[PDB]
Write a protein that binds this ligand. Structure first.
Ligand SMILES: OC[C@H]1O[C@H](O[C@H]2[C@@H](O)[C@H](O)[C@@H](CO)O[C@@H]2O)[C@@H](O)[C@@H](O)[C@@H]1O
Ligand SMILES: OC[C@H]1O[C@H](O)[C@@H](O)[C@@H](O)[C@@H]1O
Ligand SMILES: OC[C@H]1O[C@H](O)[C@@H](O)[C@@H](O)[C@@H]1O
Ligand SMILES: OC[C@H]1O[C@H](O)[C@@H](O)[C@@H](O)[C@@H]1O
Lengths: 142, 140
């Protein structure tokens, strides 16, 4: 709606769907991982208020991506894996216009990659349960 | 503009179709790998056809009917005769999925479009289709 562009999600069909929408300003992403991607904390600002939403389960070790001034997410990549009978994100990483982060997680499977030649990530959607079943992104120019 | 990809290698020469008003059809030329693509589309009142990549292989045409649009692209980036090229390519419309076109396996990629559509292409081509990316636009 309202001219959104959503690509993905990559991953499985388990868990519960989530959708952050594209209205907020992402300030940091915290990926929790061990053998696979357990979940993600997305911290954003909106009208001067800072909020964090958690998706996926409670396991794993955190790996934070803190966006500096003038830093944007311009890529996402990873692996879709079969783990404990579930189709989940086995690995997940991101690129900014300054640096590559990760991938985080240690289970291979079917790779995916989202290089963004023109544009940036402006929000997330996906599925979460005990682990991070799936992830997708909203895109916008620059 | 929103441009995602390209997926593929760094050989050949760059191409850029830019976005279209409406894509009419896409022809994927393939054999062992993806040789190239034809795109027929409307543009500021004109009907146009553009060819990218080489002229080898056999064509496979996807015609987009009334109210039909491209909502996915997937394939495999393969190693072939010392080049990194598209080994397989396929597309999904809001009605059906098509492909794979090509026969050489490699590193898979996939672009499901949950909201929006493919409106044009860019990439690299030589004898084969070295790389491919897409322009994305929202749904009307
Ligand atoms: O987030 C992954 C997965 O987690 C939970 O399911 C676990 C287990 O209870 C299931 O029996 C197996 C097989 O489906 O998968 C997991 O290990 C659920 O939240 C599930 O919906 C979700 O896909
Ligand atoms: O990633 C899945 C799982 O992997 C390991 O067993 C640990 O790192 C856990 O904390 C984590 O939940
Ligand atoms: O796809 C690469 C190549 O594969 C085969 O050798 C034939 O189908 C050719 O015409 C084609 O050019
Ligand atoms: O397209 C595959 C291959 O075709 C030709 O040999 C050249 O144009 C290369 O640069 C290119 O990589």
């Amino acid at each position: 709606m309202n001219g959104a562009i959503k690509v993905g999600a990559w991953g499985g069909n388990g868990g519960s769907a989530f959708d952050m929408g594209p209205a907020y300003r992402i300030i940091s992403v915290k990926i929790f991982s061990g053998d696979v991607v357990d979940g993600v904390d997305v911290t954003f600002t909106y009208y001067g208020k800072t909020e964090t939403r958690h998706y996926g389960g409670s396991g794993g070790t955190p790996h934070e991506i803190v966006l500096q001034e003038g830093e944007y997410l311009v890529g996402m990549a990873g692996e879709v894996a079969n783990y404990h009978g579930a189709v989940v994100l086995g690995k997940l990483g991101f690129s900014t216009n300054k640096k590559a982060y990760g991938p985080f997680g240690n289970t291979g499977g079917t790779p995916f990659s989202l290089p963004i030649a023109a544009g940036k990530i402006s929000g997330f959607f996906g599925r979460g349960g005990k682990f991070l079943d799936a992830i997708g992104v909203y895109l916008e120019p620059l």
